[PDB]
Structures are given as structure tokens and as C-alpha cells.
Amino acid sequence: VQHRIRITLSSKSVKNLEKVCSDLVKGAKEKQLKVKGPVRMPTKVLNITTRKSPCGEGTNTWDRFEMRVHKRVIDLVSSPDVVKQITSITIEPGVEVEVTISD
Amino acid sequence: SRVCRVCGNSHGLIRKYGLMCCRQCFRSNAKDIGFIKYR
Amino acid sequence: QISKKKKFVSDGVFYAELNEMLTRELAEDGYSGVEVRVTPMRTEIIIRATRTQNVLGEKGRRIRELTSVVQKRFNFLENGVELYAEKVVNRGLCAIAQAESLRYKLLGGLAVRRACYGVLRFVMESGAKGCEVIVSGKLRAQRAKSMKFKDGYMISSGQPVNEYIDAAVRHVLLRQGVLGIKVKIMLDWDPKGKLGPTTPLPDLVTIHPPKEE
Amino acid sequence: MIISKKNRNEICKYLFQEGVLYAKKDYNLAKHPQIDVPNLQVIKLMQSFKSKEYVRETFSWQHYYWYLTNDGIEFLRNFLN
Amino acid sequence: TVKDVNPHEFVKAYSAHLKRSGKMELPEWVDIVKTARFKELPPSDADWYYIRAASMARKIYLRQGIGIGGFQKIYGGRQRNGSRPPHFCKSSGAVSRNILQELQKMGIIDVDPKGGRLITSQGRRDLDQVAGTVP
Amino acid sequence: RGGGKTSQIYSIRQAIAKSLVAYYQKYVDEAAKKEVKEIFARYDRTLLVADPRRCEPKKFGGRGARARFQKSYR
Amino acid sequence: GRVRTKTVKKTSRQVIEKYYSRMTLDFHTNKKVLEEVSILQSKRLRNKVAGFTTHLMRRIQRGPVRGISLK
RNA sequence: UGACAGACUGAGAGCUCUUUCUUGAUUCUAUGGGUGGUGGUGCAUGGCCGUUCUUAGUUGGUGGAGCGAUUUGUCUGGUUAAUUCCGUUAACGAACGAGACCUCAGCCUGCUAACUAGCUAUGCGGAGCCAUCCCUCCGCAGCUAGCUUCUUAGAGGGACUAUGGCCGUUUAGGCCACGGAAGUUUGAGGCAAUAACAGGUCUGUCAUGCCCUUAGAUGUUCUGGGCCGCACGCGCGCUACACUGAUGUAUUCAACGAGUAUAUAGCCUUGGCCGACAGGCCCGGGUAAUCUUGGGAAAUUUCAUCGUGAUGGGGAUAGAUCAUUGCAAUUGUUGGUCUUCAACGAGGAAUGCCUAGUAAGCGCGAGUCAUCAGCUCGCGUUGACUACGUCCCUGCCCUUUGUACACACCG
Ligand SMILES: [Mg+2]
Ligand SMILES: [Mg+2]
Ligand SMILES: [Mg+2]
Ligand SMILES: [Mg+2]
Ligand SMILES: [Mg+2]
Ligand SMILES: [Mg+2]
Ligand SMILES: [Mg+2]
Ligand SMILES: [Mg+2]
Ligand SMILES: [Mg+2]
Ligand SMILES: [Mg+2]
Ligand SMILES: [Mg+2]
Ligand SMILES: [Mg+2]
Ligand SMILES: [Mg+2]
Ligand SMILES: [Mg+2]
Ligand SMILES: [Mg+2]
Ligand SMILES: [Mg+2]
Ligand SMILES: [Mg+2]
Ligand SMILES: [Mg+2]
Ligand SMILES: [Zn+2]
């Protein structure tokens, strides 16, 4: 009856992801569910350094590109339909949801 | 036998994270992919 | 199964190939950008242009062409991905549209300076805080030279450059050389968000009037 | 280019059913996706349709996007239909 | 016990203990080996084999789940490559594996479930008893 | 956890010194720790308050924080 | 190096004009007062402006003062 | 169009030939037109990048002055890191640059939390021991927490020269002092104006004008060789010339990043076993704060051996063999084992970088990558000497002044 359903959230955006994150939490808090979140995960930072020039001339100058990636986790003690009954609100642009059934 | 997915150049190639871009075509498309130059 | 790093790069490269593919075709259509959304059971490609009847073709023939070859090329489940054609709420605030308009004028044979001032006043009459246009190439003479047309306000440094400037670069292949077009358009503070950005310039202040009671 | 009538016929079958097609710059891959062909016959007969403007060819930065055009559907109609 | 006593002076005591704790077997390759790829000479000391044992009988006592591919690291060190820059170098596993083999046969350590090498119930006793026998 | 050898000894110094006054603040007396603090502070000021000093990032054009590659003209 | 620039200087005079009696000598109250009579984009700049309204209001409270016109 | 054997040829390329099959209007022949080109021209160009130039500089409108080029605004002065300010004022009012801004670091026993982070308590389990319990170190699970100090990551808080003193047109600002995590804009970076350079890039780009060639090709493809060759001169570096050390024990402390179906385990690889090292065979974990890895890093710290000796400093050169990567190791890919034991005794005239977690020392990760890192980009570890100044040399900005200079004193 009462399972272990984990929702995993990743994105490139701090503000945008916590919009969804908190809404899911307040979504299910209005149902008084056992909501164990959000567990906040170390931010991954993809990186590329490339030489600015297309010809290898001049003072060698480097630009450090990078990408922040943020990792969020929510626990719900609920059903496979109660999870989907909640997680139907408008997912804001780009935010990744990958709910799966944990152990 | 590895070239840029954009231009087909054999040099200065970036396989890191699986972009397979040359160091120049990447710079041309860097912000579009979403690599922000924060620093 | 694919990891998060390879995932986020995969989405990013898809956008670029798509957006740099939506320029080969919708050149003489006023293409301005693409919004690649991913919904449950559906993935959006919100093409947006300043001439919508052109991209649709006749009775949605061209859009059929576009959705299916995108379908096939990037290995989506068939009936998965969709393409849509919005219209840009303002034309002057998008340098992509203005650069391509300026390109097509020069190609056709309008005088060069007639085109640049025409673009410049249009963008300003569209509501921009400022505009800047640069043309560089061989005009009438073998030695190359560059012309710069500027109007209104314009910033160049700091962080607010990213959130207030809409800039485009387009090549033009006029016979006997290449004239590159740079259109730098400055936006205005728009709290609604639909035309311009939402936060103001970092050194803009508003001291509220001292109401009396 | 010497394409067999069999190999020719399988190119244009796909043209009618779908309307669009896409090769790469990759020469002699020996197996096109979505059809059976070594990718050179497709590429160099799209050029035959493009030369006679039955396909509209966006060269798509050496990545070969093609849309079949009304001028050539009538002409390709009289071959396998 | 083990932690109140100097991790150096104690192991001298335990190196004098595996001499006279009866005895065990001992390789017919013991006196030639350099114990690592990067070493210059074999260990100087004649009774180094028991010191390596005593030093490595505290490893499992103070840890758990160490294989041979990790025991190599614990005794590795810097490697000078002459002209080219020096690096880290991982020591040899034949020496490390065999020390485990002996103490296995002697009831100080055992093979470990979940992978590794784990201390014995009664081996903990002597490593704590001889520990008490240090100043 | 972390640091090196020397940094840890300067760390345990504060951990011991600070932990005493926090215990004294919470459990002995507030004005019986004013004596304790001025013992620690009149000796060294860094038994209660850390160093903000950290490893300045490396920048290109050289292999150090400030050091630059050697320059040659001819 | 901490020479206050035009924005901090100009706003500081102007903000006193509209609200003189409402201010005080407390930097933090002045920081809070300045918070609810304006819209700004950085707290560092807010303290700089509130920093140039605090002692400025000593020299106003002490003697006369330039362009700022106190009723 | 495609092919059998042999000749011809490295070629099991049918390339050409002997010969006679096989495919069927696809083509082949010429005129014309296209196409491709890492072919030329960066002095025809775009785009990008560097540099002038790391400094504080640049420009309209209206008004003033001059026949005019031009000028004023944009300044005598004080101040500032700053054309940043106080002010001045034939200018007034504006636009860029500077600042603001943005990112990581430095404080938060306050907030949201968190079994993919983890203390704390208690249950047991192992040991020592005045031992029976208690005291100590340890391993395993939980409705243990009025758990979040430690970790992650969100919110916001905090510093503003705020308060005090002396200085100053007592203005702008300067020096200092208690407090504080923090008082060079707290630290370091990102962005960064106008005008230019015949700066570099046509060899990044089916970006590109013109020219060259276009089937006996400057097109593509394959084999092999070269880019690595060695009298010599130059630049960035690695390793040293030792005892503040080499070697051999024992001891043990980080941080940033990384793991493309990788095919039938496979990129990172734990643990078991074989093996002297090298490397194998086996069971597996992880698309990852979960497994690798809490990355058990080195210098360092101990204890011995060496003893002023080109020595055991140093490790070039070379001989023999083994193993791994790959389709292939030869002009040694690299990693092992034994042996060989060179120059070098702190480097002439010259000359580079550098002002606090800095220089210098030490190692690690990432890029390239099948294999190869003496490189570059980052990371952490130990951690100073010196200075708190000047315009002397080299240059930069502004003013005044002289010029027979304007491709502008390299005149
Ligand atoms: Mg060294
Ligand atoms: Mg060629
Ligand atoms: Mg040039
Ligand atoms: Mg150029
Ligand atoms: Mg005038
Ligand atoms: Mg006049
Ligand atoms: Mg004027
Ligand atoms: Mg700064
Ligand atoms: Mg180019
Ligand atoms: Mg070379
Ligand atoms: Mg260099
Ligand atoms: Mg030696
Ligand atoms: Mg040593
Ligand atoms: Mg490497
Ligand atoms: Mg100085
Ligand atoms: Mg004179
Ligand atoms: Mg002259
Ligand atoms: Mg002269
Ligand atoms: Zn490319």
C-alpha cells in the first residue's frame, strides 16, 4: 500500500529547479504524505578549456567554459498513482524528472 | 577517423563528454549548447 | 542507460544542430529562434518567425516536411516529436530577424546606406533603448572598409550585457567579396518580460515619491 | 554513376512513402539508414533530382537534407506508382 | 592497547614476537626481492620479512577489507625515473600477499567476506596482549 | 580529516582551545571563561579564530598563482 | 580607493531630500529605511548609499549643506 | 558493367593482356557547362583572435571662439586604483569606457533539510585490564535523537570606511585604532570603449572574390617513405652536481576532476588466485555524494646504513632478454630484469618571473589518448627572505614647450 517512490531532478538552472522541487514538496504536503526531501546532492560542474584563437597566434589565452548541474532527490511514501496524481503540474522548461520505484 | 560533427575537421578535436567538436566550431556553438563562461 | 553528463551535453548539441539547421531553410522566412521543450509523451520544437505563413507552406505541407525529417534524423519514436510556428511579439527587438532583413536588402540591390538606416530607425521605432549596426567588406572599392550606424543607448561591458543585448552576425555573399553584418540591439527594462528583460540595469535606481499624509 | 534499376527503384519507393530523406557526407558507408543502399547512389541521384529540380536540397552543412518537390512528384509518379 | 603504544616501538616488539612465536614457512625467494618495481636495492635488514608482517598485521587490525591491489599502494612510494619527472609507484603484491598467507595460517588475520582481509577474533588478543608488553 | 600534517596540528589547537570555552560558556560560568579566553588570546589570537588564507587559483600564462613563463626576446 | 562615485553620491543627496525626518544616525536603520523607499539591484550598493547618507546627515545635522535643499 | 589462371605488378587491384563468358540503354564518345581542391593571394574579404594598452581613455547635440584646419565642453587646483570625485567654469545637457555588475574563496553551533552525507546515544557483539560490572579501543543493525557540530546545497544575514582619533579648502578624501571572519574595491578571476595594425588566420568552417587545375587531376583512394634525418647557432624546460643528502625500514595527511553498448563484462576498475618485477586468470560494482575512491599522493616524519671520495652524488649511453597496446613497434611506442656508470665540482658576458598561503619545494587530476606527458590547463601539500618605495634604467598617462618630422626619430 505504502511504497518507496523516489523522484530525481536534474537541471542546468538553480532557480528553475527549486521552483519545481518546492512545488512537488508542497504538492504532497497538502496531501499529508510522508515526503522526505529534498536531499541536496553535490553540484557537478562540466568544464572545457579551449584556446581562444583559431590560429594559435598571439598571447596564448584560454577561456574556461563550464556547466553547473544540480541534483535533487525527493522521497514519497505513496503509490504509483499517487506519485503520478501529484507529478502532473506544469514542469518548467528543461527540468528533468525521472521518477522510479526504489527498493 | 574522428572528425568534428559540425565541419569534419581532423585537428583540435574535443571528445571530452562526447561533444566531438573541433576547438573552433565548439567555441562558435558553446553558449548554445549551454557552456556558460562564468569565469 | 546514459549518465547525467552525457545527457546534458546530448540535449545541448541537439539544440545547436537544430537551430543551425533551422537557418539553412528558413532563411528567407524571418526565422528567429527555436524553443525545444520536452513534455511527457511529447517533445516540443517551437519554431518562431516573423512570417508564419511561409514556414507552414501551403496547408501545412512544409511543416510536414520539417517534422518528419527531424523525426527520422535524430532517432525519435515516430509520432514522438512535433514542430510549431509562433510569431514574434516584436520584430525590431530580435537581431536575428533584423540581420536577415538587412542581408536580403543588400543582396537584392538596395543601396547599402539606405538599408542600414532603414534597419536602424525600424528597430528604434520598435521600442529599443538603442541599436548598433556594423557592415564590413569591399564596397565600390577593392580595399575593405567598415561602416558603423548607431542610435540610442548602448552598453558593452559587465554582466548586464548578456541580459540586455540581442546581437546577431550574418555573412552576405555580395558578388566580389563578403560583407559581414553585425546587428547589436539593446533591450529595455520590461517587467512583464515579453519584450525586454525583467531586472533593471545594475546602476538604475528609483526613489519612490514621498506620499503625504 | 551506374545504379541498377533495382537499386534505383528502392530509392524512390521511400521518397513517395515519406517525402523527406537524409544522408551524410560519409562516402561508401555501404548501409544507409532507413533504406538499403551504400549512400553514394542516394547522394548522387538526389543530385540528379536536384539538378533537374525535383528535390529541394538544403546541403545542411555537408549533412544532406532533402525535400521532394511538386515539380518532380509528377515525373517520379510515372516510374513507380 | 594498540593505540596507546607507539606505532613504531610497538612494531619492533611484534617483529621480535613473530620470530619467537614458534615459527612458520618462509619463501625461497625471500632474500633477493626488492619488494617493488621502483626500489633500488632489496630491504637492508635480514629480519625484514617479519617487520613487514608486524607492520602489516596492524593494518588489518586498524582497518578492514584491504586486498592485494590496495596493499601494494600502502607500501609504494615515490619513484625517481632519472631524466623524466618522478611519480608515485605502487609496490609489489607477491610480498604483500604472502605475509597475509602466513598470518592466515597463524590465526592473526583471515580472509574477509564482502572482499578483503579481516582480523581474527583471537588474533586481536595477541596484538592487544603484546601491545600491553610495551613501555 | 583533511589538510596535511602541520595544518592539522594548528587545527587541533583551536579545537581543544575553543571546545573548552564553549563547554565553560554552556556549563560552568560565563565569567569563569573570560579568564580562560584572555589566557588564549594574550598568547596567540589564532586559537579561537581561523586563518581565511587559502590556495589562490592558478591562472594561465604560467604555472603558478603569480609566476609567469620565462620570457625570451631573441 | 573607497571614493564614492556619482550614483552613490547623487542618490544619497536625493534620498535625503524626499525623506529627511524619517532618517536617523543609525547605519542599519538607515539601511533598512533605504530598503523601503527604493528598488535596487545589489546589497553592496545599498550599504554604500546608506553609508553616504549616514555621516552626510551628521554634516547636515551639524551645519549647512550643498545642493540638497532641506525644507 | 563484373569476373578464372598466369604474365605484369607489394598486391587475394581483373590494372593491363591471353580468351569467352556476364550486365543490359544505367551508360561510353565530343562540344558546353558543373564539381572538387590542406592549390595561390590574410596586400581582395567575412568571422574570430591577439596587440597598440591594463592604462583611463573616446564622442555627438545646442551654444561660444576662429576665414579655416581646429577648438571649447573633456579644466588651474586637491583627491582617487580610475576623465573616480570636490570643485572650477563659454559652456549646458547627454552618450560610451571606469565603477556598479557577474563567478568561485573567507564568517553563519541561526533557517530548509538530508540514510547516495554523518556525528550522538543505546542494544549487543570482540578484546585488554582492580577483570564482574565499570574504564578504554573496535564491528553490526534500528522509531535513537528536543540529531545537523562536522559534509552537501538552497535561502537569505554580514562590511558600509560603520565607530574613534589626528590630517585636509577641515569638501572630496588620507593615515591609524578598539571591534570583527573579514578594513589593498576582503581575495582572485569573467566582462571590458573610440580609433587602429595592410598583426595572424583562405591549413578550423560545402565562410569566401579573383586566379590555377579539372581524368595522363593540384580531385579522391591504396602501398611505402618523410615531417624524427645531423657539422652547427637559438628558445621554453626536465634531471642534477649531494649529508638541509642517497638508499632501505617503519610511520600516514589532501584537493580538483574522470568512467562515449565501452560486446557479450566493457570505460574507471574493487576483492580472490598465479606470478620476482612486468603482467595474467577469476567473481564481480558503478551511466555514479551509491562502485572505482572517505581517491591510504609525494615532499615530509622516524630508525638505521653511508662518510667529503665523480662516492653508494648523477643517470646520459649501450648490450642481452621478457610483457603489454595496437592491423602492424624497424630508425629502440612504452613498462620490466641484469649489466654498462658519461658530462656535470653552483655555471662568463648577459638575462626572466615574483610582494602572502605568494616565491620556491612536493605530488595529484584533466586535455591529447589504442599505446606514449620532460607539455599545457587545474588541484591540493609544506611554506619563507625581502619591500610598504622611486622615477635611476625600460615603458605608460596628462600638461607645457620646440620641430625643417606626417610611411610620423627605425623621421
Ligand atoms: Mg623533484
Ligand atoms: Mg589532396
Ligand atoms: Mg591582416
Ligand atoms: Mg582579419
Ligand atoms: Mg558648432
Ligand atoms: Mg563661426
Ligand atoms: Mg560643439
Ligand atoms: Mg575586483
Ligand atoms: Mg579563416
Ligand atoms: Mg616537428
Ligand atoms: Mg611557453
Ligand atoms: Mg641513486
Ligand atoms: Mg626515504
Ligand atoms: Mg596525461
Ligand atoms: Mg607601489
Ligand atoms: Mg628650438
Ligand atoms: Mg612630406
Ligand atoms: Mg637618426
Ligand atoms: Zn568543427
CA–CA gap between residue B13 and residue B22 (Å, rounded): 4
Return the sign of the alpha-carbon dihedral for residues A74, A77, A79, A81: negative
Cell triple for residue C126?
520598435
* DSSP three-state, residue E39: coil
C152 bridge partner residues: C130
> Which residues from chain C sit within 8 angstroms of residue B19, using beta carbons?
9, 13
Helices and strands: H and E segment counts in chain E: 5, 4
- What are the b/e assignments for G21-37, b being 16+ CB within 10 Å? eebeeeeeebbebbeeb
Looking at chain F, which runs of residues are DSSP E strands?
none
Contact call for B and D: 3+ CB–CB distances under 8 Å: yes
Q: Dihedral angle at the C-alpha atoms of G2, G7, G10, G11, nearest 10 degrees?
A: -110
d(CA A76, CA A37): 8
CB–CB contact B39 A66 (8 Å):
yes
Are C50 and C97 contacting, i.e. CB atoms less than 8 angstroms apart?
A: yes
Which chain C residue is nearest to residue A98, measuring alpha carbons? C40
Which residues in chain A (6-65) have CB-CB distances under 8 A to chain F? 59-62
Closest CA to A35 of A48, A23, A47, A53: A23
> Cell 547618507, residue?
G53
DSSP G69: -
Which one-letter amino acid corresponds to residue A11? S
Residues E53 and E18 sit within 8 Å (Cβ to Cβ): yes
Residues E66, E117: contact at Cβ < 8 Å?
yes
Which residue in E59, E43, E48, E42 sits closest to E18, CA to CA? Answer: E48
Tell me how far apart the alpha carbons of residues B7 and E125 are, in angstroms, rounded to a whole number: 70
Residue of B nearest to C33 (CA): B32
Q: Which residues are bridge partners to C46 per DSSP? A: C35, C84
Question: Using an 8 Å Cβ cutoff, are A77 and A31 in contact?
Answer: no
Residues of C in contact with D58 (CB under 8 A): 24-25
Rounded distance between C-alpha atoms, residue G9 and residue A41, angstroms: 44
Nearest C-alpha of chain B: how many angstroms from A61? 13
Asked if C15 reaches chain A (Cβ–Cβ under 8 Å), the answer is no
Angle at the Cα of G58 (from G53 to G64), degrees rounded to 5? Answer: 100
- Spatial CB neighbours of C174, under 8 Å, sequence gap ≥ 6: C106, C107, C137
Is the bond leading into E85 cis (omega within 30 degrees of zero)?
Answer: no
Please answer yes or no on whether B14 and A54 come within 8 Å at the CB atom.
no
Helix (H) or strand (E) holding E20: helix E9-20
In the chain, the amino acid numbered C117 is: Y
* SS3 assignment for chain C: CCCHHHHHHHHHHHHHHHHCCCCCCCCCCCEEEEEEEEECCEEEEEEEECCHHHHHCCCCHHHHHHHHHHHHHCCCCCCCEEEEEEECCCCCCCHHHHHHHHHHHHHHCCCHHHHHHHHHHHHHHCCCCEEEEEEEECCCCCCCEEEEEEEECCCCCCCHHHHHEEEEEEEECCCCCCEEEEEEEECCCCCCCCCCCCCCCCCCCEECCCCCC
F interface with A, Cβ–Cβ below 8 Å: 60-61
Identify which of A46, A94, A96 has the shortest CB distance to residue C5. A46
Q: Which of C93, C103, C76 is nearest to C18 (CA)?
A: C76
Backbone angles phi, psi at C86, to 5 degrees: -85, 170
